[PDB]
Structure formats: structure tokens, C-alpha cells
Design an enzyme around this catalytic site. Structure first.
Site, mmCIF file in Angstrom:
data_model
loop_
_atom_site.group_PDB
_atom_site.id
_atom_site.type_symbol
_atom_site.label_atom_id
_atom_site.label_comp_id
_atom_site.label_asym_id
_atom_site.label_seq_id
_atom_site.Cartn_x
_atom_site.Cartn_y
_atom_site.Cartn_z
ATOM 1 N N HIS A 119 0.807 -1.212 0.000
ATOM 2 C CA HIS A 119 0.000 0.000 0.000
ATOM 3 C C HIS A 119 0.847 1.272 0.000
ATOM 4 O O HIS A 119 0.333 2.363 -0.238
ATOM 5 C CB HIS A 119 -0.998 0.007 1.171
ATOM 6 N N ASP A 125 -0.536 -7.165 1.616
ATOM 7 C CA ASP A 125 0.071 -5.853 1.664
ATOM 8 C C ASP A 125 1.563 -6.048 1.846
ATOM 9 O O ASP A 125 2.114 -5.810 2.921
ATOM 10 C CB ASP A 125 -0.507 -5.025 2.809
ATOM 11 N N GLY A 174 3.158 6.587 9.023
ATOM 12 C CA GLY A 174 4.556 6.803 8.708
ATOM 13 C C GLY A 174 5.422 5.604 9.081
ATOM 14 O O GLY A 174 6.588 5.524 8.678
ATOM 15 N N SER A 182 4.304 2.636 8.389
ATOM 16 C CA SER A 182 3.885 1.701 7.353
ATOM 17 C C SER A 182 5.087 1.168 6.589
ATOM 18 O O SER A 182 6.083 1.868 6.421
ATOM 19 C CB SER A 182 2.924 2.389 6.383
ATOM 20 N N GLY A 183 4.989 -0.078 6.138
ATOM 21 C CA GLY A 183 6.080 -0.693 5.398
ATOM 22 C C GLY A 183 7.201 -1.154 6.313
ATOM 23 O O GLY A 183 7.931 -2.088 5.999
HETATM 24 C C1 LIG Z 1 1.255 3.718 7.428
HETATM 25 O O1 LIG Z 1 2.319 4.260 8.223
HETATM 26 C C2 LIG Z 1 0.914 4.662 6.273
HETATM 27 N N1 LIG Z 1 0.654 4.191 5.108
HETATM 28 C C3 LIG Z 1 0.367 5.240 4.234
HETATM 29 C C4 LIG Z 1 0.441 6.484 4.852
HETATM 30 S S1 LIG Z 1 0.862 6.374 6.501
HETATM 31 C C5 LIG Z 1 0.039 3.519 8.373
HETATM 32 C C6 LIG Z 1 0.361 2.572 9.549
HETATM 33 C C7 LIG Z 1 -0.874 2.276 10.412
HETATM 34 C C8 LIG Z 1 -0.537 1.448 11.634
HETATM 35 N N2 LIG Z 1 -1.703 1.469 12.514
HETATM 36 C C9 LIG Z 1 -1.806 0.977 13.751
HETATM 37 N N3 LIG Z 1 -0.960 0.042 14.209
HETATM 38 N N4 LIG Z 1 -2.770 1.454 14.527
HETATM 39 N N5 LIG Z 1 -1.052 2.921 7.583
HETATM 40 C C10 LIG Z 1 -2.176 3.510 7.174
HETATM 41 O O2 LIG Z 1 -2.434 4.698 7.425
HETATM 42 C C11 LIG Z 1 -3.172 2.640 6.361
HETATM 43 N N6 LIG Z 1 -4.545 2.908 6.891
HETATM 44 C C12 LIG Z 1 -4.938 2.673 8.173
HETATM 45 O O3 LIG Z 1 -4.188 2.206 9.021
HETATM 46 C C13 LIG Z 1 -6.369 2.992 8.596
HETATM 47 C C14 LIG Z 1 -7.265 1.744 8.462
HETATM 48 C C15 LIG Z 1 -8.722 2.009 8.898
HETATM 49 N N7 LIG Z 1 -9.582 1.000 8.822
HETATM 50 O O4 LIG Z 1 -9.087 3.119 9.312
HETATM 51 N N8 LIG Z 1 -6.885 4.046 7.747
HETATM 52 C C16 LIG Z 1 -6.769 5.353 8.002
HETATM 53 O O5 LIG Z 1 -6.184 5.763 9.034
HETATM 54 N N9 LIG Z 1 -7.318 6.179 7.079
HETATM 55 C C17 LIG Z 1 -7.323 7.648 7.099
HETATM 56 C C18 LIG Z 1 -8.111 8.161 5.875
HETATM 57 C C19 LIG Z 1 -5.876 8.151 7.081
HETATM 58 C C20 LIG Z 1 -5.495 9.263 7.905
HETATM 59 C C21 LIG Z 1 -4.158 9.744 7.888
HETATM 60 C C22 LIG Z 1 -3.178 9.124 7.050
HETATM 61 BR BR1 LIG Z 1 -1.426 9.765 7.014
HETATM 62 C C23 LIG Z 1 -3.539 8.023 6.230
HETATM 63 C C24 LIG Z 1 -4.870 7.535 6.238
HETATM 64 C C25 LIG Z 1 -3.054 2.974 4.838
HETATM 65 C C26 LIG Z 1 -3.707 4.326 4.474
HETATM 66 C C27 LIG Z 1 -3.722 1.872 3.995
#
Ligand SMILES: *[C@@](O)(C1NC=CS1)[C@H](CCCNC(=N)N)NC(=O)[C@@H](NC(=O)[C@H](CC(N)=O)NC(=O)N[C@H](C)c1ccc(Br)cc1)C(C)C
Length: 233
Positions: free
Chosen positions: A44, A93, A182, A184-185
Site C-alpha cells: 500500500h 500488503d 509513517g 507503514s512498510g
Molecule cells: C502507514 O504508516 C501509512 N501508510 C500510508 C500512509 S501512513 C500507516 C500505519 C498504520 C498502523 N496502525 C496501527 N498500528 N494502529 N497505515 C495507514 O495509514 C493505512 N490505513 C490505516 O491504518 C487505517 C485503516 C482504517 N480502517 O481506518 N486508515 C486510516 O487511518 N485512514 C485515514 C483516511 C488516514 C489518515 C491519515 C493518514 Br497519514 C492516512 C490515512 C493505509 C492508508 C492503507
């Protein structure tokens, strides 16, 4: 990273920081070195990323301020995403990055052993991500010890999401320590018999470190076959 502590320089040799140049440079995601020219990370992380040319990989980093326009970095020759990936929240992912040049291992950058399929505890999630849902990238690499939580246990916390066996959750019943935006990955590293293994790739979760909301990670062991298939010549 929420509720963690600053790491020591070289404390997590495999951890790298992936940057994107479009529209302007900035930390994009975490990543793990696992071979001379192979970086493992979440799929992702390349949503809307057209050319591998916008990606820049930095290893041996402790503080983001180590990175300036005149800073060296490994170019990304190829971006390999799992052919079944669709949504981070659906699984698969996982993604591989083939670096343009070979990586010279040193005390600050070494790879991490992939978990053994024959193994299907002492875990840490590291990263430069947020310290809370709304926040900013951390200059100094953060780290936090998080316990793995069974999938039956995870599913319950996520009545809306379907937590397959290709996923593994880690967090505290009470929250407070978890990965955030942040991270992520990035790696979820666990140490067994004093040998580190890349058990998970930071993927998603509801909020950050909330009570009864384990962080969802990609279950790496379920992909070593896929990995060896992609890393092969
Ligand atoms: C990664 O670091 C990122 N990937 C892409 C940008 S930042 C994070 C890690 C999350 C670890 N979470 C935890 N242990 N609690 N991943 C994400 O942001 C992913 N989305 C989500 O975790 C959630 C999932 C959900 N069901 O809500 N989505 C989310 O937070 N969405 C909102 C719209 C969002 C807000 C701020 C940011 Br910077 C990104 C998304 C990815 C987006 C798949």
C-alpha cells in the site's frame, strides 16, 4: 510510533526510510533490508506511485535530518507488488524493491533473517512515524516492544474487518504502544534465541495505540515462498 523510545544509532540495522520526490521529498514509508539489493515493505506504500524513479532509499539512518539534498541514497530499480494485492485491509500488503546498486553491509546496515516456514515473542515495531493519530514524522527513529495478539483475539477487536491467516496483530489490551502513520512498510522485528526475524510489515489499524485496537501487520512467514520466487534471478 506511539509510546516508544528513541533508538540508538545502528540499533535496527535493517530499518530504512523510503522517500518519494513527488511532489516534493518526504519520508514515505518504512522498510527492511533483506538482501544486497532487496528491500521489503508494504504494498500500500506505493498507491499512486508511477515510476520507481521517484523512490529514494536511505539505510543506516537514525535521524531524518541526516537526509539533505546532498545525501546519498540507493536508487530503486524495480517495484514488485504481490499480484493479489488490492487493499491493505484485505491482505497481501507486501512489496519488494530491487535497488539499483548493491548494498555494502556495515555496522549500520545489515539485513534481517526471514522467519523460517518451519516456524509457522520478543517483538519490536520501529519507525519514524507519528506519536499519535494527528502529529508529524519523528526526526529520531522510534522503537517499541509490542506483544503479538492471536488472530481470534484480533478478529474480535475488528468486527468489521476480516483478519486472515496472512495477517498477525500486535498491541496491548490497553493500547498506548503501537505503530502509527509513517511506520507503514516498516518492520516488526522479533528476536528468538538472539536471532532477529522479520515477522511482520506494518500495515494498518484503527487509529493509533487505542484500547483494544491491535495494529495489523502483514504475516511475513506466509510469504517467504513468494519472496524467494521474486528474489530469484
Ligand atoms: C502507514 O504508516 C501509512 N501508510 C500510508 C500512509 S501512513 C500507516 C500505519 C498504520 C498502523 N496502525 C496501527 N498500528 N494502529 N497505515 C495507514 O495509514 C493505512 N490505513 C490505516 O491504518 C487505517 C485503516 C482504517 N480502517 O481506518 N486508515 C486510516 O487511518 N485512514 C485515514 C483516511 C488516514 C489518515 C491519515 C493518514 Br497519514 C492516512 C490515512 C493505509 C492508508 C492503507
Amino acid at each position: 510510533i506511539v509510546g516508544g523510545t528513541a533508538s540508538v544509532r545502528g540499533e535496527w540495522p535493517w530499518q530504512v526510510t523510503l522517500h518519494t520526490t513527488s511532489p516534493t521529498q518526504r519520508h514515505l514509508c518504512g522498510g527492511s533490508i533483506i538482501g544486497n539489493q532487496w528491500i521489503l515493505t508494504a504494498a500500500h506504500c506505493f498507491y499512486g506511485v508511477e515510476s520507481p524513479k521517484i523512490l529514494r532509499v536511505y539505510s543506516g539512518i537514525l535521524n531524518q535530518s541526516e537526509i539533505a539534498e546532498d545525501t546519498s541514497f540507493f536508487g530503486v530499480q524495480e517495484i514488485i507488488i504481490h499480484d493479489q494485492y488490492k487493499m491493505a485491509e484485505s491482505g497481501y500488503d507486501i512489496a519488494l524493491l530491487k535497488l539499483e546498486t548493491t548494498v555494502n553491509y556495515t555496522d549500520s546496515q545489515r539485513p534481517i533473517s526471514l522467519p523460517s516456514k518451519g516456524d509457522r515473542t520478543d517483538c519490536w515495531v520501529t519507525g519514524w512515524g507519528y506519536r499519535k493519530l494527528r502529529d508529524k514524522i519523528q526526526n529520531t527513529l522510534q522503537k517499541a516492544k509490542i506483544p503479538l495478539v492471536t488472530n481470534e483475539e484480533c478478529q474480535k477487536r475488528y468486527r468489521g474487518h476480516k483478519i486472515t491467516h496472512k495477517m498477525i496483530c500486535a498491541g496491548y489490551r490497553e493500547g498506548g504502544k503501537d505503530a502509527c502513520k509513517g511506520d507503514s512498510g516498516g518492520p516488526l522485528s522479533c528476536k528468538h534465541n538472539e536471532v532477529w526475524h522479520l515477522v511482520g510489515i506494518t500495515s494498518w489499524g484503527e487509529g493509533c495505540a487505542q484500547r483494544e485496537r491491535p495494529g495489523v501487520y502483514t504475516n511475513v512467514v506466509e510469504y517467504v515462498d513468494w519472496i524467494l520466487e521474486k528474489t530469484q534471478a
